[PDB]
Write a protein that binds this ligand. Sequence first.
Ligand SMILES: [Mg+2]
Ligand SMILES: [Mg+2]
Ligand SMILES: [Mg+2]
Ligand SMILES: [Mg+2]
Ligand SMILES: [Mg+2]
Ligand SMILES: [Mg+2]
Lengths: 206, 97, 217, 81, 129, 87, 48, 121
Amino acid sequence: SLPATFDLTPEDAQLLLAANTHLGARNVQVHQEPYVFNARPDGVHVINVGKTWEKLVLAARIIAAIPNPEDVVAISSRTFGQRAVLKFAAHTGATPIAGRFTPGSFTNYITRSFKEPRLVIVTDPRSDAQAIKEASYVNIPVIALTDLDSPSEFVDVAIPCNNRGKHSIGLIWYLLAREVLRLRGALVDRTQPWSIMPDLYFYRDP
Amino acid sequence: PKKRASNGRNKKGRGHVKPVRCVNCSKSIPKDKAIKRMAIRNIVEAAAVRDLSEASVYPEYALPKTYNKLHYCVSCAIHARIVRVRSREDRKNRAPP
Amino acid sequence: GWVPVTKLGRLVKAGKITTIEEIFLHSLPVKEFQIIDTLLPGLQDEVMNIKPVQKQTRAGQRTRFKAVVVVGDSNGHVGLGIKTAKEVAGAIRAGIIIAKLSVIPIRRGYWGTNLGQPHSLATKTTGKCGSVTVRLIPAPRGSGIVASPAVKKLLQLAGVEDVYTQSNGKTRTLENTLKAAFVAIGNTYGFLTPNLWAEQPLPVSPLDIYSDEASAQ
Amino acid sequence: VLVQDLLHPTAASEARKHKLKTLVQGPRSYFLDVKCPGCLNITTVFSHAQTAVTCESCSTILCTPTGGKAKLSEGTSFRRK
Amino acid sequence: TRSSVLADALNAINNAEKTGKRQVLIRPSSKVIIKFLQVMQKHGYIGEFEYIDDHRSGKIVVQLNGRLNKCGVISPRFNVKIGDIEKWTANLLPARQFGYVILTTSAGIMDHEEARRKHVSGKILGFVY
Amino acid sequence: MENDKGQLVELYVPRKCSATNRIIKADDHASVQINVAKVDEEGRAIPGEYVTYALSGYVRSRGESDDSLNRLAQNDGLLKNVWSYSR
Amino acid sequence: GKGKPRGLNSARKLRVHRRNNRWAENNYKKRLLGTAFKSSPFGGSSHA
Amino acid sequence: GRVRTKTVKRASKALIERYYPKLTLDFQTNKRLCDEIATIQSKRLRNKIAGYTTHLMKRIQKGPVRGISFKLQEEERERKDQYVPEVSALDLSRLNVDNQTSDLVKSLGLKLPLSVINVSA
RNA sequence: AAAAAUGAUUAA
RNA sequence: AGGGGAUCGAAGAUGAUCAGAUACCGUCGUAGUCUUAACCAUAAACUAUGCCGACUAGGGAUCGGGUGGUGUUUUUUUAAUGACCCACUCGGCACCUUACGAGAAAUCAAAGUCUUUGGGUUCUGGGGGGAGUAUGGUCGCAAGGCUGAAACUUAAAGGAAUUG
Ligand SMILES: [Mg+2]
Ligand SMILES: [Mg+2]
Ligand SMILES: [Mg+2]
Ligand SMILES: [Mg+2]
Ligand SMILES: [Mg+2]
Ligand SMILES: [Mg+2]
């Protein structure tokens, strides 16, 4: 069976609501359609936070299955995800890729930046399309932080959130790292919250 | 081979439009195909705006404008550098800028 | 010697992966030819044609030679490599490397009764490259290879000993003909048959089982 | 997509779809019991009448035809079914 | 206009199978279609299918199990002797060990193996493999 | 793959997609094998014990890989109320 | 589809269409017109 | 023209990477230091390298430069990258939700402090 | 928006 | 054939340019351009994509009709209406992304569902020329249209794309 402790806890529910992770895109693709809750006047849709949290738990279960922690590569070319992925890579092994992706990172075995990950997590499929495509060339499963209008091609595990907000992006990365640590012999306090407060995952200029 | 999906014009659904004449050469070109530009120009040049403002009975005069729709054939538009032949991939771009 | 760069090469060199069937089962991309050399040592080679291609420049025409190389043991593996280079020998050598990388498993079946080892294809298959369509059809025992000499040589290097072939398009384009036949012979494991209907337990990858000693720093 | 329950679809989805394009096609019009202030008679009218039906007592006009549903008169009450 | 509801049925099933769908809607779903589906269901190429009873012609929802490579009609329905069944199977089937050519014989709609067991022949309807 | 006297004769038996049951070819470089670690009490990943799904390059390129995974996880108990059979 | 009739009772149309389009071959046209007999320096002979 | 080629640019950048504290704003001592922190086959190239090194230094002094990370820069960057605010930018600080958001909370079955806001088209 | 024609055969 | 006949303008005139210019350019200008009553029946008459039917992909628009509103709007400062907004839906002219598919490619939501070849049906083609010629027929007042060869000749002609 599955323990009920993994349910949508009130605290991280308040966190997601404060981060506005439920305010999805105005336009929804049919592949993201099952994740929508309901549309508000002016057109803004609402993401089912229950689906978001459940998919985040599933993604964390994906991550905590590779025997090595350094071959779980995170990608974010967007400024709002640079700090988030760097902190995720600090807390877990998870060698990161912030900024330009340098096409040929997964192919081109003689490159110095060449990596052979077993799992790829990307902040935005649009901005990070090169990483997803090259993973499609080299048999790499992909978790992605997806909005309601983000493309679903080659995206294996989607997490329906708001990609237009730095608070939502940083919080989702924070929760993913926290859940991954919980599903390990390092963060046993499943009911207790993580020590450090999640503002270190948020980008601030410059 | 076929150069453009919209052959050289904008006509999909009727078959005949009407011909307009080029302003330069008076070449008969279908209206959907003619390169059309809006010439909205102040009736006085910038070198003269200050002078007419100084030499007007009517203080803060309206400073009227002139409006003209110009129809060019393809040849005259290219020769006058109105359109400036583009590359193959940039040929599809419809944006005015 | 050979110092592996990828995890697959590290596993194969260390000896954790012993047969190319594991490679094919997990559909692992292969990037080093030494993997193919050490997993299929009895992989023999053949050059199909050498043709010159020319590029026009200010100072005349510069000529390079494009070599077509077919590798394969007669026990169900072939690879096709096309490489252009300044010299014929260099093009042939790089073509051998490329074909070894592009080695593929084929499915031998029976035409009628299954008396003995498989002798033909399990199903008629068709491949296309450019205008050339190649169709391979299962044939009864004692039929031989009914094909043009190039496709016949590729099929012998594949291990097929009984098959009919039907071609269409400009078959004199040898590289298109060989690529089309390579696609057709590779689609044999792509075609699903009732004897493959049974569900399998979906085994885990050697890149995950023998993973603690891979990608060592 | 790629896996759907075509036999048991959503009532909101069928309410969205075209009248001819549901799992089993059927009408979306209806019949109205109509009461005018003139008398106590009840007149059964069709939602998309396409005629100017008239009451037995108020024998001038009850509804006006339109493109779709009939435009019932302002001095009139109605009840579905 | 429609001339073979069986052809539209098998084309729709084939397109859903190619696109990876696990279920397909068929209309108008005659009883020849139903017999064709029962033959392929007997051999395992499809799963459960459902007749929707609208009061005009019916519908079928077929559950697809991904085991079907191609199904289609042979139009027109040529008459076939006993000895031309082998020629038709050679022409239409990928292999001699699996796949079926569907016949409409006086004994009923059956597959070519069943026809050869019954020593019967008829018109050719379609194929499945 | 079976000859007269038993003795299965074949190079290898290919895997089938967990979503569409199509064969994953040896050169299908867009395919994946998603691996979900089983979880015991109080949330431990217990490495080495897994539930495995094979997804084809075709379905991934089509964009239904995520919905296929939602359905498979729902059917296998990994997820609770994510995938709805009736859309 | 295919721009040619398919019905079981269209054999006359198919045969006539093949007969008509057969006239676009060279050898069939020569055989049917008897050009070698009529317009050829030899009377269809190998030598003369 | 006086564009400095990649050999001068890369050698100067490497010098900045390796000996930023030792190097000084002026060409004379930068040139003298180059005699032993590097081996250059020609005095002309050494002078060019030192001139570009001191130019890069005079630019680094008034703000950082892209692509160059001297020893005193990455510790500063990482220390800046640990700024933890005392109060969370998002926390219990007054939350504001819509009718649909309240409906979502009720559907998921949770109890939170919500405030009603009606979005107007 | 001045005028501006021509260039033997073979010879990769 | 009658009327009309401003404009522009096959022919023509005439001035330039030019080696020549009975061309381009300039100025005139008959027939035509317009109309009525009759003829003619041809166009790169083009989407160079026959027609009918089914299915397969992700969007934003727009035209016509219809449906619905914890919608607005000039009237009653809270009425049908009309006009906008949002969500749909049927039909249409079309666009954007990508092809999973097709194609020699250019490209194509059809040019897909094609050697895994069969939904129905009409028309046309069979290397380049000779040649849409000759002849016969038929229509036209004529111009010409429709139908339409052969002798003979010849190794390419041709499509798309690449480099220069
Ligand atoms: Mg051209
Ligand atoms: Mg026209
Ligand atoms: Mg046209
Ligand atoms: Mg035409
Ligand atoms: Mg329209
Ligand atoms: Mg000809």
